């Protein structure tokens, strides 16, 4: 009974958009110690770093 | 002109203080410092109260 005909569907999906953000406070003191450690040498206390 | 410049050591200044240096900083507000004794006393009395 020749009546059949396969069908193919074509759905497309959108991507949407999300994000996550947070704050991370640096104390003047922590970035303080930071500044010397980038140039760590005989100076700049190691226990401090 | 140059604002007047010959150095750290040419008359008489360093005993408002004594020292110890203090580089590593970043930890105190009203911490400690000590010693461990006290002030003269008792061999004039009666057989005192």
From Swiss-Prot, chain B:
It is found in: Virion; Host nucleus. Transmembrane segments: none annotated. Disulfide bonds: none annotated. It comes from the Viruses. Belongs to the herpesviridae major capsid protein family. Homomultimer. Makes the hexons and eleven out of twelve pentons. Interacts with triplex proteins 1/TRX1 and 2/TRX2; adjacent capsomers are linked together in groups of three by triplexes, heterotrimeric complexes composed of one molecule of TRX1 and two molecules of TRX2. Interacts with scaffold protein; this interaction allows efficient MCP transport to the host nucleus. Interacts with capsid vertex component 2/CVC2. Interacts with the small capsomere-interacting protein/SCP. Self-assembles to form an icosahedral capsid with a T=16 symmetry, about 200 nm in diameter, and consisting of 150 hexons and 12 pentons (total of 162 capsomers). Hexons form the edges and faces of the capsid and are each composed of six MCP molecules. In contrast, one penton is found at each of the 12 vertices. Eleven of the pentons are MCP pentamers, while the last vertex is occupied by the portal complex. This is Major capsid protein. The gene is MCP. The chain holds residues 75 to 123 of 1396 of the full protein.
